[PDB]
Design a protein around this ligand. Sequence first.
Ligand SMILES: Nc1ncnc2c1ncn2[C@@H]1O[C@H](COP(=O)(O)O)[C@@H](O)[C@H]1O[C@H]1O[C@H](COP(=O)(O)O)[C@@H](O)[C@H]1O
Length: 83
Amino acid sequence: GEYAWYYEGRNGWWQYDERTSRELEDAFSKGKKNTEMLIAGFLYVADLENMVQYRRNEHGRRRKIKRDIIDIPKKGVAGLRLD
Ligand SMILES: Nc1ncnc2c1ncn2[C@@H]1O[C@H](COP(=O)(O)O)[C@@H](O)[C@H]1O[C@H]1O[C@H](COP(=O)(O)O)[C@@H](O)[C@H]1O
């Protein structure tokens, strides 16, 4: 039973990078309703009640997030395609 964090792409799921995934897991484990993440130098909000992420300070997409097993189909990790 091993788990990872994922964010929605247009037609699939991407796994979060290792550091961010650990931060999400910490926040989830403490019962936090939300947390902030640094993604490529930009601040994002992870809303753990509604299970969505979005950029903190400027416009962007709302992406679904989920916590699921490692052994699911996925597109890659943090924008780096699996080959
Ligand atoms: N948690 C994250 N980790 C890495 N990159 C991210 C993340 N959140 C946003 N970005 C990137 O930040 C940009 C703006 O996202 P927005 O509007 O939400 O703030 C996007 O390019 C985001 O990257 C995604 O989309 C790419 C295409 O994936 P397809 O739809 O073809 O599956 C792919 O690189 C994928 O990683």
